[PDB]
Design a protein around this ligand. Structure first.
Ligand code: THP
Ligand code: CA
Length: 129
């Protein structure tokens, strides 16, 4: 997989962000994770966490997997990096997402993310508290 440039347009919630990619605005949905909706427990904390990560980043990059690059809603599906750190993994390591929506052929980082979720669960963090 490879990283490609993008710039932030707007934070949305824990697992979606509006980015400019190849010069076009698109909403990205983070692969392999599910954050609570803003209206649910830990929703506001997830949204805040992702917002801080992406707003503070000097460099945002998008990494598509081997499969589908847009979902049925027209959202890009990617792993998102902020100054080299993967947002998807950071959410899992903090207990602010669950690994989910693991579809065959778009699951390159599944085991990296499950390892982070295991460590969050051992620490009883946030969702696992
Ligand atoms: C993460 C992801 C979601 N989706 C679709 C599945 C779910 O469809 P349904 O809307 O029919 O439940 C929806 C969940 O995204 P959200 O968690 O953002 O609601 O997005 C994909 O198709 N591929 C993906 O990789
Ligand atoms: Ca969600």
């Amino acid at each position: 997989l490879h990283k490609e440039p993008a710039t932030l347009i707007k934070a949305i919630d824990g697992d979606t962000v509006k980015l400019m990619y190849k010069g076009q605005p698109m909403t990205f949905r983070l692969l392999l994770v599910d954050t609570p909706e803003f209206n649910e427990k830990y929703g506001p904390e997830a949204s805040a966490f992702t917002k801080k990560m992406v707003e503070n980043a000097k460099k945002i990059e998008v990494e598509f997997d081997k499969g589908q690059r847009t979902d049925k809603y027209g959202r890009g599906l990617a792993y998102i990096y902020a100054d080299g750190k993967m947002v998807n993994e950071a959410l899992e390591r903090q207990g602010l997402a669950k690994v989910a929506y693991v579809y065959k052929g778009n699951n390159t980082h599944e085991q990296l993310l499950r390892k982070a979720e295991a460590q969050a669960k051992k620490e009883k963090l946030n969702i696992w508290s």
